[PDB]
Symmetry: C2
Subunit: 166 residues, 2 copies
């Protein structure tokens, strides 16, 4: 029959998942980047596989954050602005959607397919160069505790979760 | 205009990606499981996030293996059987598709949505219990080199890749 949507339950859930998945993808990636030997030529394949593992998860979740936004203008408005800012950054960075789409597409759906060299290019575009620090810190900085939560995606997503918990 | 499909190029690519992504997801998961402190209560969230990271990737790739199979009966037939066996195991294990679908679905598409407790249940179903060893070893065993390649998903996928390289 009919019922209440419990929108807010679903939203708290999704927000919480976003915080954890984005945080862990960054942490894992940084952990492995801390192993210098992985930058050697005989480990390139393995290293690339780690990057895809973490990057695919980041892009899937960045898009989810946008999709949540476009579904729920039912949002607390004291943060209405910072939220749109992060929403906008993600759309601006088109490598994100491109990577998500490829990673998630059905094998038969080749309209979204990126060849391996293309995936590599898209990853460089996403990070805006050869250095991951900026983008990673923008997703989730180390010791996010002592951090202006306006200054990272995960902090902003936490700003919303905590508000919704009320 | 019209051209050759270069099916075989695409297939070599996808197979190669499958080998690397399945292998790394298992390796990462095992690496973190080797850190005993992560099983403590204050780390449950983080530990769960690691499991989702790796499990989502495994399920996405297991399904891709099936989808590749259903798209290309153009396949070497000396391995025609082992391939269908692994294809069948994956379909049999319905938690795999369920998890894939949830992880990949659009936020607005709630026909596939699993609540957090449901995701946890599905993960236990996938592993057929509280111990990951069997399923993980079935995906990709340690030192896969000294291993009957018929005895793991990744070995079988390597059996095909290597053949296709010809």
């Amino acid at each position: 029959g009919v019922k209440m949507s419990d929108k807010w339950i679903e939203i708290e859930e999704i927000l919480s998942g976003l915080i954890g998945d984005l945080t862990i993808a960054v942490t894992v990636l940084k952990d492995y980047e801390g192993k210098a030997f992985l930058r050697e030529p005989q480990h390139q394949t393995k290293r690339q596989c780690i990057w895809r593992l973490c990057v695919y998860s980041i892009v899937i979740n960045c898009r989810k954050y946008v999709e949540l936004n476009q579904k729920y203008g039912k949002e607390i408005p004291g943060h209405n602005h910072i939220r749109g800012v992060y929403n906008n950054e993600i759309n601006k960075n088109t490598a994100i959607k491109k990577l998500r789409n490829h990673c998630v597409a059905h094998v038969s759906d080749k309209s979204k397919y990126l060849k391996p060299a293309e995936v590599q290019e898209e990853i460089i575009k996403m990070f805006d160069g050869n250095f991951a620090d900026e983008f990673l810190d923008w997703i989730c900085p180390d010791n996010i505790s002592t951090t202006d939560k306006s200054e990272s995606l995960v902090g902003v997503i936490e700003l919303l979760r905590d508000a919704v918990s009320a």
